[PDB]
Amino acid sequence: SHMCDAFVGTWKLVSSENFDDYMKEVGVGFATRKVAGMAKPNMIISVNGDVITIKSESTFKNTEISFILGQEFDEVTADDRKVKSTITLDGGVLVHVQKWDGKSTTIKRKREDDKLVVECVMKGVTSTRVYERA
Numbered sequence: 001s002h003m004c005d006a007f008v009g010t011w012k013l014v015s016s017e018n019f020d021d022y023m024k025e026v027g028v029g030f031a032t033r034k035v036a037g038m039a040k041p042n043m044i045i046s047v048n049g050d051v052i053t054i055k056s057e058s059t060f061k062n063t064e065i066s067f068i069l070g071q072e073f074d075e076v077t078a079d080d081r082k083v084k085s086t087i088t089l090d091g092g093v094l095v096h097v098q099k100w101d102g103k104s105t106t107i108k109r110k111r112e113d114d115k116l117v118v119e120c121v122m123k124g125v126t127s128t129r130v131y132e133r134a
């Protein structure tokens with residue numbers, strides 16, 4: 001009975017576009033870009049009361065965030081950035097802003113047909129990562 005019901009579940013990466021260029025823009029170094037770009041993560045989303053948990057599991061890294069919408073938290077990203085994150089729901093889209101070293105990136109997650117579409121933006125550079133139910 002929402003929040004976020006249509007996001008909850010276990011999702012597997014099925015396509016990616018422009019992720020190397022997005023990672024370059026973020027500042028990810030060569031070796032991490034190569035290994036991270038190979039990964040085929042599973043994204044596991046769950047909700048318990050007001051707390052949303054998003055796990056990413058791959059051969060590269062396992063990460064986990066738990067958060068309340070609108071409430072800032074500290075996140076260590078898969079590429080080892082120490083960021084301050086805030087996630088909100090905007091018109092049915094989860095909007096995740098990460099701030100670090102005067103920089104910012106925004107990750108949007110939305111349901112489109114049977115997919116979960118993730119759009120990662122850093123300045124002018126967008127990467128689109130498509131997940132399907134596992």
Ligand SMILES: CC1(c2ccc(Cl)c(Cl)c2)C(=O)NC(=S)NC1=O
Nearest residue numbers: 023026028036041056078079118129
């Ligand atoms: C693990 C992952 C990510 C995101 C940004 C960077 Cl920069 C890196 Cl290295 C890895 C990913 O591979 N794909 C998605 S959609 N979410 C993530 O949390």
